[PDB]
Amino acid sequence: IVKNDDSWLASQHSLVSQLRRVWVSENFQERHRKENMAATNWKEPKLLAYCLLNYCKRNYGDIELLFQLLRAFTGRFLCNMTFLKEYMEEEIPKNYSIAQKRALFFRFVDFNDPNFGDELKAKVLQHILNPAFLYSFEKGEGEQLLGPPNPEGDNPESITSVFITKVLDPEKQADMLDSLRIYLLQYATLLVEHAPHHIHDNNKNRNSKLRRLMTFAWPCLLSKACVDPACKYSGHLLLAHIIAKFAIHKKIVLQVFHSLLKAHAMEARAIVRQAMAILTPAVPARMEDGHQMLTHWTRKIIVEEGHTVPQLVHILHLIVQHFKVYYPVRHHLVQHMVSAMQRLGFTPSVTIEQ
Amino acid sequence: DQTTLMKKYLQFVAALTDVNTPDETKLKMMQEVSENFENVTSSPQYSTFLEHIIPRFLTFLQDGEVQFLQEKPAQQLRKLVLEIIHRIPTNEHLRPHTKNVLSVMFRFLETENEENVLICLRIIIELHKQFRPPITQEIHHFLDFVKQIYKELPKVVNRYFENPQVIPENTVPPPEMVGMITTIAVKVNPEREDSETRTHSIIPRGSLSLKVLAELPIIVVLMYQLYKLNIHNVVAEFVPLIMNTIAIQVSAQARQHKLYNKELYADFIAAQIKTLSFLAYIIRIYQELVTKYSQQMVKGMLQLLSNCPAETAHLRKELLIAAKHILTTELRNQFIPCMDKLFDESILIGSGYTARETLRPLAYSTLADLVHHVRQHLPLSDLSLAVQLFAKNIDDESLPSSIQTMSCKLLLNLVDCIRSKSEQESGNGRDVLMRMLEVFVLKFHTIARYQLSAIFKKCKPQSKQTFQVTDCRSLVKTLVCGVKTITWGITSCKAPGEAQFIPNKQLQPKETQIYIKLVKYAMQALDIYQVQIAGNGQTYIRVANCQTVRMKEEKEVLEHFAGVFTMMNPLTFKEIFQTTV
C-alpha cells in the first residue's frame, strides 16, 4: 500500500505507532539477529524500515522514530538497508531546514531513553547529525544553525554551548563507549573547523568552552596502555584542529606533537596521518620558534629512538609528506635522512614498501 | 677541539664511577654525553673511546645495587647508561666489547628491574642480530631462566589477579607486591593531616613483570634461528610450558574484585599472545610434541580469543596472525568440534571499534581458510552456520570487495558439501541452497543499482577507479560461478520430507521467481564488462553497437551465465524466459 500510495501512511498515526512498537521491540530485533538461515521472515526488517521511513519522510517532527531506524545499523541483517543510509546521509541534509536540523540536535541532547544505548547515539551522530551539519556549514548556514555565539555557555539556544556543557559533561565521560566518543570528537571537529568564532573569541580574556573542549579531548593524551587507538588519535585530531585554529600555549602543542610522533602503530595510521597533516603546518605558524621545535623533536625521536624500525619509518613518512614545511630546517634533517635511507634500502630482507 | 671534547667525555665516564660526585651532576654529564654521540663516532678515536667507556660503563653497572624506585637519581642514571649502551653503533668496533656486554646483560636479566631488564633485552637482541656470536653457556642459562619464568607464571597470576594485596597507605611497598610501574604518594609525617608530601614510583622486579615475559619469546626465536643445531632439544621443553601458559585463564571472580587492574590484565594477555606467536613459529618443527599437547591448545587459543580486550586491537591482530599460521598445519582437525563457537563473531573479532573496522578481513580470511580445509568434516549445522556468516559477509558494504569475493567463493565451495551432508542427514540442505541463491541474486541487484551506477557516473567519453572496476569484474565473475554451482546443488538435492529424488524436477513458482529476478539483475550486472580501462587512465564505456567481443573473460562468464539456465527443466526455462525475453 505504501509503495502504491506514498502519502497514505503519513496520516495513519496509530498504525505507525504499532509499527514502531514492533520495530523497537526486543523480541523482533533478537529474532532477526539470531535467525536460522532458513527463516522465512528475512525480508521483514527491510519492509518495516521502508514503511517507517515512508512515514518519517513527510513527518519531520517525529525525530524519535527517525532515531529508532538506526537499529537497522546496529545489527547485521541479511537484507540491504542501504536505502536508510542513503536517505539519512543524502536527503536529510538536503531537505531538512535549519530549524529542523536544530530540532534534530536538541532531540539528540535530551534523548533519555533507557533502551537507546551509546551505540545508537553513535549511529545518530554518524548518519544524521554530522552529515546535516557538514552540509549546512558548507552552504554557509552556520550562523543560523548554531544560533548565538554565546561566550558564556548558559544560553540554551547556542548549539556549541549546549553541546560542550551537556553532551561533553565530564560526569558522563566515564562509561563512554569508544564509538560514541569518536563520533562526538568528529562533531566537535566540525564545530571547531567551520565555526571557530562560536567556540572561542580571541578578544575574550578567558573562555571556559575552549578549556572544556580541550578537557574532553585531553584523556587521549594520558599515557594509559589499554585504549582503542582510534579514540585516542581522534582526540589528537581534535586537538590538532584546536591548535590550528586557536593560539594554544606551547606546552600543549609540543605534547600533542610528541605524542603523534610516538604514534608509529599500524592500527591508527590514517588518523595519525590526518592529525600530523593538520598540525605540522600549524607549528611554524603558531610560535616564534616553531622551526626550531620541529627540528628538535624530529631529531630527538629519530636519534633516541629508531633502534626499532617502525618508529623511524613513521618519522620518515612524516618528513616525506611535509618536506615543504621542513625545508627551512633541511640542513639538520638531511644527515639522518640519508643515513636512514641507506640503512632501510640495504638492510637484509627489505620489503618493497621500505 | 674535538680531541679535547672526547677527553672531556672520557673524564665524564670516569667520573661516573666516582663516589664524591653528586648524582645530579652525573645525570647532567651523561645527558650531555648521550646527545653528543653523533660527533664522537666520526673520529678514529671512537675506537679508543669505546675501549675506555664500555669497560667503565659495565663496571659501574656491575657495582650498583639494583634500584627499584623510578624517581631515584640512581635509577635514572642506570637507565641512561643502559640506553647509551643500546645507542652505541653496532659496527666492528663494538665486536671486542660485545662478549663482555652480552655477559653483563645476561647477568642483569636474572636480577634487575623491569625498565633495565627491557633495555638489556633490547641490547641482547641487537647484538645477537648484528654480530651473531657462537654459542656459550650464558645462552643455556638464559633458556633455563626463561623456562623458570614460565614455571613461575602461575604464581604471578595467583599473586596479582587471584589474591591481590592492599598496599598499606602512606607506605612504600616492596617491588615484589606490585605488578607494574605504580605511582604512590607519601606524607612524611603521619602524625598530622598537614605534612611534607613526597611521591614515588615503584618498578617491579624483572622476574615478576609480565612485560619481560612478553618480550622473551622473540629472543628465544632469534637464538633458535642462530643456534638451530645446538638448542633444538632445549626448545622442546618449552612446548608443554607454552601450552600450559596459553591454557591459563583468570577466574571470573578475580576480574570483578575491587583491586582488579585492567592494565596488568592487558599485559598478561599480551604475554600469552606473544607465547602463542612463539608457538606458531615453532609449530612446524615440533609438530609431534605439539600434537600430543594440541587438545589443550585448542582451548587455550579459543580462550585467548574470548578474553582478548576490545581496546587492544594490536593484540587481537597478533593473535589472529598466530592463529592463521597455526591453522595451516594438521592441528585444524582438532577445531572441528569447537568451530560452532569459533563462528561467534564476538569471539573472533570482539566489540572494539578499531578491531571491527581493521581486522574483520583478517578474521574472515583466516576462518574461510579453516572452513575450506575442514569442510568435508563439518556437520550440516556447522555448514549452515558458516553459510549464514559468509552470506552476511556478501552483502556487507563495509568490507572490501576482495572479502566479498572471498566469501562468495567460500559459499560456492560449500554447496557440494551441503548437498552431501543434506543427502546423508535427509535435512534442509535444499532450503539453505535456496537461501544462498537468494543472497546471490540480491548481491547482483546491489551491484546493478549502487556499484555500476557509480562506475558509469565516473566514466567520461573517450578522446583507484581501475581497482573499483577490476574488483567489480571479479565479483561479478564469482557471482556467476556461484550461481551456477548453487543451481547444480539445488537440481541435485532431495527436498525436505520428499520420498525420493528424481533426476530433474520442475521448480516451484517461488524458485522460478527467484531465477527471473536473477535474469533481470544479472543482465544489468554483466554491463561492467562494457567499462574499458585505457592505458592513459581513462575508463570509458565501449561502443554500444558491437557484438564482436574481443575479451575471453566476458565470453567465458556469459557462457557460464547461460549454463545456469540450460541445466533446468524445460518448463522452468520456458516460464522464466517467456517473462524475461
Nearest CB to B387: which of A37, A79, A178? Answer: A37
Closest C-alpha among B531, B539, B533 to residue B460: B539
Q: Please give the Cα distance from B357 to A270 (Å, whole number).
A: 12
Q: Is A182 on the interface with B (CB under 8 A)?
A: yes
A285 touches chain B (CB under 8 A): no
All three cell numbers of A228, joined, read 582503542
CB-CB contact of B374 with B336 (8 Å)? yes
Q: Do A78 and B86 touch (CB under 8 A)?
A: no
Fill in the DSSP letter of residue B399. S
DSSP per position, A329-353:
GHHHHHHHHHHHHHHHHHSTT--TT
Residue in the structure block whose three cell numbers are 612524611: B188
The secondary structure of A250-306 as a DSSP string is: HHHHHHHHHHHHT---STTHHHHHHHHHHHHHHHHHHSTTHHHHHHHHHHHHHHHS-
For residue B198, what are the β-bridge partners?
B186
B442 close to B404: Cβ distance less than 8 angstroms: no
Q: What is the 3-state secondary structure (H, E, C) of B98-122?
A: HHHHHHHHHHHHHHCEHHHHHHHHH
Q: Distance between CA B68 and CA B279 in Å, rounded?
A: 33
The enclosing H or E element of B307 equals helix B287-307
Q: Can you give the length of chain A in residues?
A: 354
Task: Identify the bridge partners of residue A46 per DSSP, sorted by sequence position.
Answer: none
C-alpha cell, B399? 568490507
Cβ proximity of B223 and B131 under 8 Å = no
Q: Which residue has the cell 590538532?
A: A240
Q: Do B313 and A267 touch (CB under 8 A)?
A: yes
Distances (CA, A) of B143 to B223, B236, B419: 9, 11, 53
Q: How far apart are CA B273 and CA B249, in angstroms?
A: 13
From the list A38, A179, A225, which residue is nearest B431 (CB)? A38
**DSSP state at residue A127:** I
What is the number of alpha carbons within 13 Å of residue B522 lying toward its C-beta? 30
In angstroms, the CA B29 to CA B13 distance is 8
Is the Cβ–Cβ distance between B240 and B108 less than 8 Å?
no
Q: Do A78 and B352 count as a contact with CB atoms less than 8 A apart?
A: no
Point out which residues pair with B187 in neighbouring strands.
B197
CA B232 to chain centre: 26
The alpha carbon of residue B173 is apart from the nearest alpha carbon of chain A, in Å, by: 22
Interface test with A, best of B210, B311, B443 (most A CBs within 10 A): B311
Cβ A87 vs Cβ A53: under 8 Å: yes
Q: Among A34, B399, B446, B351, which Cα is nearest to B390's?
A: B399
Length of chain B equals 581
Rounded distance, CA B464 to CA B526, Å?
21
C-alpha cell at A293: 621545535
Contact A125, A186 (CB under 8 A): yes
A224 — contact with chain B (CB < 8 Å)? yes
- The CA-based angle A192-A213-A117, given to 5 degrees, is 100
Query: What's the distance, CA B538 to chain centroid?
Result: 38
The DSSP secondary structure of A40-60, one letter per residue, reads TTTTHHHHHHHHHHHHHHH-T
Cβ-based neighbour number of residue B541 at 10 Å: 15
The answer to whether the beta carbons of residues B359 and A268 sit under 8 Å apart is no
Decide if A47 touches B, using CB distance below 8 A: no
Kindly determine whether residue B397 and residue A76, on different chains, have CB atoms separated by under 8 Å: no
As beta bridge partners, residue B201 has B183
Q: What are phi and psi of B252, to 5 degrees?
A: -65, -35
- Rounded distance between C-alpha atoms, residue B451 and residue A115, angstroms: 35
- Is A304 in Cβ contact with B87 (below 8 Å)? yes
Triad B33, B38, B41: Cα angle to 5°: 95
Closest by Cα among A113, A110, A112, A15 to A55: A15
**What's B396's DSSP letter?**
-
Asked if A190 and A133 touch (Cβ cutoff 8 Å), the reply is yes
**Residue A305 sits at the chain B interface (C-beta within 8 Å):** no
A307 and B126 within 8 Å at the Cβ level: the answer is: yes
**Which residue in the block uniquely carries the three cell numbers 583507484?**
B464
- Dihedrals phi, psi of B202, to nearest 5 degrees: -100, 130
Q: How far apart are CA A192 and CA A160, in angstroms?
A: 10
Q: Which helix (H) or strand (E) holds B344?
A: none
| Residues 78-117 of chain A whose Cβ lies under 8 A from any Cβ of chain B | 78-80, 82
- Whether residues A229 and B313 touch (CB distance < 8 A) is answered with yes
User: H/E element holding B198?
Assistant: strand B197-202
Residues B77 and B31: beta-carbon distance below 8 Å? no
Cβ–Cβ below 8 Å for A303 and B395: no
**Helix locations, B112-237, DSSP H:** 114-130, 137-157, 210-226, 232-236
* Cα-based torsion angle of the residue sequence B572, B576, B577, B581 in order, rounded to the nearest 10 degrees: 180
Which chain A residues touch B313 with a CB distance below 8 Å?
228-229, 267
Burial class (CB in 10 A: 0-12, 13-18, 19+), A152: exposed
Taking the C-alpha atoms of residue A69 and residue A52, their distance in angstroms, rounded to an integer, is: 8
Write out the three cell numbers for B264: 596488568
C-alpha pair distances (Å), B2 with each of B29, B46, B146, B369: 17, 11, 45, 62
On the 0-12 / 13-18 / 19+ scale of CB atoms within 10 A, B193 is exposed
> What would you report as the CA-atom Rg of chain B, rounded to the nearest whole angstrom?
33
Which DSSP string do the residues of B401-452 spell out, in sequence order? HHHHHHHHHHHHHHHHHHHHHHHHHT-SHHHHHHHHHHHHHHHHHHIIIIIH
Per-residue cell: A126: 554518524
Within A114-228, where are the H helices?
118-124, 130-139, 142-146, 159-162, 178-194, 196-199, 208-217
Nearest-CA distance from B432 to chain A in Å? 6
Q: Tell me how far apart the alpha carbons of residues B469 and B463 are, in angstroms, rounded to a whole number.
A: 20
Gap between the Cα atoms of A292 and A250, Å rounded? 13
Cβ of A227 within 8 Å of Cβ of B428? The answer is no
Q: What is the DSSP string of B479-520?
A: HHHHHHHHHHHHTT-PPTT-S---SS-PPPHHHHHHHHHHHH
CA distance B391 to B383: 12
Whether B78 and B24 have beta carbons less than 8 Å apart is answered as: no
Which H or E element spans position B27?
helix B23-35
CA nearest to A124, candidates A108, A112, A101: A108
Element holding B67 (H helix, E strand): none
- The helix or strand, by DSSP H or E, that contains position B186, with its residue range, turns out to be strand B182-187
Distance CA B158, CA B155 (A): 5
Q: CA distances (Å), B449 to each of A86, A343, B429, B442, B523, in order?
A: 13, 50, 30, 10, 12
CB neighbour list of residue B228: distance below 8 Å, 6 or more residues apart? none
Question: Can you tell me which residue has the cell 570482539?
Answer: B350
Taking CA atoms, B85 is separated from A10, B25, B44, B123, B134, in Å, by 76, 20, 19, 8, 21
Instruction: For residue A258, count other CB atoms closer than 10 A to its CB.
Output: 15
Closest listed residue to residue B35, CA positions, set A330, A254, A299, A335:
A299
CA atoms of A174 and B421, how far apart (whole Å)? 51
Contact A228 B38 (CB under 8 A): no
Binary contact (B317, A178; C-beta < 8 A): no
By the CB < 8 Å criterion, does A303 face chain B? yes
Please answer yes or no on whether A228 and B311 come within 8 Å at the CB atom.
Answer: yes
Taking each helix axis as running N to C, give the angle between helix B210-226 and helix B262-282, from 0 to 180 degrees, rounded to the nearest 10: 10
Inter-chain residue contact A78 with B262, CB threshold 8 Å: no
Give the distance from residue B385's alpha carbon to the nearest chain A alpha carbon, in angstroms. 8
A1 to chain B, any CB pair closer than 8 A? The answer is no
Count H helices and E strands in chain A, helices first: 22, 0
C-alpha cell at A209: 568552552
PDB resolution in Å: 2.3
| Of residues A42, A80, A226, nearest to B312 (C-beta) | A226
Rounded CA-CA distance B150/B248 in Å is: 11
A226 touches chain B (CB under 8 A): yes
Distance from the Cα of residue A237 to its chain's centroid? 9
Instruction: State the DSSP H helix or E strand holding residue B187, giving kind and residue range, or none if neither.
Output: strand B182-187
Phi/psi for A345 (5° steps) reads -80, -15
Query: Mutate which of B354, B359, B403, B422 to disrupt the A interface (most A C-beta within 10 Å)?
Result: B354
Under an 8 A CB cutoff, do A78 and B395 touch?
Answer: yes
* B521 CB-contact burial (10 Å; exposed 0-12 / middle 13-18 / buried 19+): buried
Nearest alpha carbon to residue B216 among B260, B171, B150, B157: B150
Q: Is-contact B151 B241, C-beta < 8 A?
A: yes
Distance CA A288, CA A280 (A): 14
Q: B194 Cβ partners below 8 Å, 6+ apart? A: none
Q: How many CA atoms lie within 13 A of B578 on its CB side?
A: 8
A304 touches chain B (CB under 8 A): yes
Residue A118 near residue A177, CB atoms below 8 Å: yes
At CB < 8 Å, which residues of chain B contact A?
Answer: 34, 38, 83, 86-87, 122, 126, 262-263, 266-267, 309-314, 317, 352-354, 357-358, 384, 387-388, 391-392, 395-397, 428, 431-432, 435, 439, 442, 446, 450
The grid cell for B344 is 561467534
- Distances, alpha carbon B213 to alpha carbons A183, B229, B256, B322, in Å: 37, 25, 25, 17
Cell 592441528 belongs to residue: B331
A81: distance to nearest CA of chain B, Å? 10
Method used to determine the 3D structure: cryo-EM
Q: How far apart are the C-alpha atoms of A49 and A72, rounded to whole Å?
A: 8
What are the φ/ψ torsions at residue B237 (nearest 5 degrees)? Answer: -70, -25
